[PDB]
Structure 1
Amino acid sequence: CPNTVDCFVSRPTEKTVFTVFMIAVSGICILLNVTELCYLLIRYC
């Protein structure tokens, strides 16, 4: 590409919406998995 070339993304807003959905659910899934580890690591140890 000569110098700097401007390029344009397809459906940036719709992709952002679905990205936020997947990141938020993954963060929730992390918390749901940490608590189970916390419960299992207070009885045994």
Structure 2
Amino acid sequence: CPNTVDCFVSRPTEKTVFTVFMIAVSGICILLNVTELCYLLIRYCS
């Protein structure tokens, strides 16, 4: 490409909405897994 070329993405807004949906659900699964992990490690130490 000579110098800098402008390029345009297809459906960027819809892709952002689904990205937010996947990230937020993925982050919740991190909290749920962490909560269960600490629950077991609370009992194991106790």
TM-score by length of 1: 0.97
- Deviation digits for residues 1-45 of structure 1, max 9, x if unmatched? 000000000000000000000000000000000000010001111
Aligned length: 45
Identify unmatched segments of 5+ residues in structure 1. none
Identify unmatched segments of 5+ residues in structure 2. none
CA distance in 1, matches of 2:27, 2:34: 11
TM-score by length of 2: 0.95
